[PDB]
Amino acid sequence: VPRTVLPFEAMPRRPGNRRNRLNQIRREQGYEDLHLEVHQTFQELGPIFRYDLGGAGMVCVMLPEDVEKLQQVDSLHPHRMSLEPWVAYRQHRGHKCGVFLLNGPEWRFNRLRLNPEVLSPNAVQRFLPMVDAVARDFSQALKKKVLQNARGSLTLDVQPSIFHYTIEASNLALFGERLGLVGHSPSSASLNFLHALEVMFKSTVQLMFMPRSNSRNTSPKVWKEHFEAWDCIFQYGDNCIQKIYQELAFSRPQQYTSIVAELLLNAELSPDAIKANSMELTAGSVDTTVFPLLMTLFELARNPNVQQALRQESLAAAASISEHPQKATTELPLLRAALKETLRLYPVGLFLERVASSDLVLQNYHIPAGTLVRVFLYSLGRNPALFPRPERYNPQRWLDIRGSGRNFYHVPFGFGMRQCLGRRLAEAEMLLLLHHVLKHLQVETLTQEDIKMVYSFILRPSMFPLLTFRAI
Ligand code: HEM
Ligand SMILES: C[C@H](CCC(=O)O)[C@H]1CC[C@H]2[C@@H]3[C@H](O)C[C@@H]4C[C@H](O)CC[C@]4(C)[C@H]3C[C@H](O)[C@]12C
Ligand SMILES: C[C@H](CCC(=O)O)[C@H]1CC[C@H]2[C@@H]3[C@H](O)C[C@@H]4C[C@H](O)CC[C@]4(C)[C@H]3C[C@H](O)[C@]12C
Ligand SMILES: CC(C)(C(=O)c1cccnc1)c1cccnc1
């Protein structure tokens, strides 16, 4: 690094030895306010600091310029601190690890053979009609509940139905199957699969935060629950892959039907590798897309001028998107901007993480090779220097957006070759559900109070309010 950069020792340090009630806050609520605690530290120390704990020091950053510098020192296979409970399940049952868990050349081999079928513009053009079909079914089911309510309006908890929508849409894109989670009586097999997804994620978070001194005897029931949930998920995956094998051998269609069928036809990855990646993509919808979809509905309820501008756009584009759902990618610029605005205020992952593959420089400080660097998305999005009136929900800011490093202003899906593999499937699900709902319905909430987010592996709303829908 240049001789003019400040030494690592000069970086502002978060005091580890202050007298305050953090000790007691940890006893009572653990790390549930970590986003706010780190945000306060950036306010005090500036946009880079060393978080000292247990003899170690994580570098905390929050600027687009830092994300750009990290993308520069990404290797051909950026290192990931693999989710241990998920790895342990694969080790125990003799399943492969997929891109969520792999490192090194094996990660890259897998990733390059998935990108064209999941992340590419061509992949999106193929799956958009399937996501559109599920979005229509969800939107029609809600409109029907509204129009049959005695009170001319429907106040409901939308959290379960929006979650079910994301699983239904993703599972259709991946395996070409409808679980039926829009019906009032979905099959026991579909509900068992959904339950297993929920238990898998809940048990992941319980195991990651299991104290060392309690693992021997508190963890075995949780490990059992985790592995039994994964067994159910892998049974569903095997069932779908066997069905696809049968279709491709004896009844092969000319047209695209599913991401997994395309991977099996390509035959670049082994069947066991395709299953592992399909199960990780399956898991990728659990407790992710639901949150920005909910928070977009919440902010549209609070910002009726923005809601009406999005409704005008969706009504003007409605005919074009009905003819070719693929048009949703270019004909709803303000709604795409609204998704960026939701994720600016309400990231799902709290941070992006890299281990410095080489010495580098961030904010004119020398960063030694091997340093843990975390980009805190909550703080990046609330920087008033880059996002004037950062508390304001203003999708127009993205159509206006200026500044040198503007490519790195929107990074809630990460960056570079190890960015979120599911990002375009997540984006399409959010875009099309909101498009179809806004054409038919208006949303409100009783109070305009900010939602409290809690950090529990992901950032999630504490007490998401009932929403009220009415016909337009
Ligand atoms: C709004 C919803 C979501 C957000 C904000 C999100 C965000 C992220 C982020 C930040 C990463 C790490 C990227 C990096 O370090 O550069 C990631 C990885 C990943 N995400 Fe997502 N994600 C979401 C939804 C999904 C969905 C729906 C799927 C699957 C259908 C998915 C599949 C994955 C996979 C497989 C990886 C690992 C990629 C790899 O390591 O090669 N994600 N996501
Ligand atoms: C290391 C810890 C406690 C060890 C002890 O003090 O006895 C034990 C408790 C539960 C154990 C895990 C559970 O038995 C579930 C898994 C069982 C597999 O046979 C090994 C990995 C596996 C993931 C185990 C790893 C490790 O041995 C754990 C985590
Ligand atoms: C930063 C914080 C410690 C802060 C403090 O004691 O002041 C630590 C303690 C436990 C850590 C978490 C746990 O190790 C569980 C998770 C492990 C994953 O690899 C990253 C996220 C993950 C959710 C961790 C994030 C973060 O490093 C946590 C929350
Ligand atoms: C939200 C979460 C946990 C995420 O931000 C993440 C996942 C892997 C690595 N880094 C961040 C995630 C989880 C599943 C799919 N995509 C994203």
Author numbering: 31 to 502
What do the paper's sentences say?
The mutant is generated in our attempt to increase in protein hydrophilicity for crystallography by replacing hydrophobic residues with hydrophilic ones at six positions on the distal surface putatively associating with mitochondrial membranes (residues in red). The crystal structure of the CYP11B1 mutant complexed with metyrapone was determined at a resolution of 1.4 ​Å. The asymmetric unit of the crystals has a single protein molecule, and two molecules of cholate are co-crystallized exposing their β-face to solvent. The nitrogen atom in 2-pyridinyl of metyrapone coordinates to the heme iron, being consistent with the low-spin state. The other nitrogen atom in 1-pyridinyl seems to interact with a water molecule which forms hydrogen bonds to a propionate of the heme and the main chain amide nitrogen of E383. Second, the replacements at the two residues (L244N and W247N) in helix G′ of the wild type caused uncoiling in part and a shift of it. Along with the structural shifts, the substrate access channel has an open entrance. The surface representations delineate differences in geometry among them. The innermost space, which is formed by the residues including W116, R120, F130, and E310, is reduced in the mutant compared to the CYP11B1 wild type, whereas CYP11B2 has an enlarged space which surrounds the C3 carbonyl side of DOC.
Human cytochromes P45011β (CYP11B1) and P450aldo (CYP11B2) are monooxygenases that synthesize cortisol through steroid 11β-hydroxylation and aldosterone through a three-step process comprising 11β-hydroxylation and two 18-hydroxylations, respectively. The last step of the synthetic pathway of the major glucocorticoids, cortisol in human and corticosterone in rodents, is catalyzed by steroid 11β-hydroxylase cytochrome P45011β (CYP11B1), while those of the potent mineralocorticoid, aldosterone, are catalyzed by aldosterone synthase cytochrome P450aldo (CYP11B2). They are a pair of closely-related cytochromes P450, and their amino acid sequences of the mature enzymes share 94% identities to each other. As their physiological functions, CYP11B1 converts 11-deoxycortisol (DOF) and 11-deoxycorticosterone (DOC) to cortisol and corticosterone, respectively, while CYP11B2 catalyzes, in addition to 11β-hydroxylation of DOC, 18-hydroxylation and 18-oxidation to yield aldosterone.
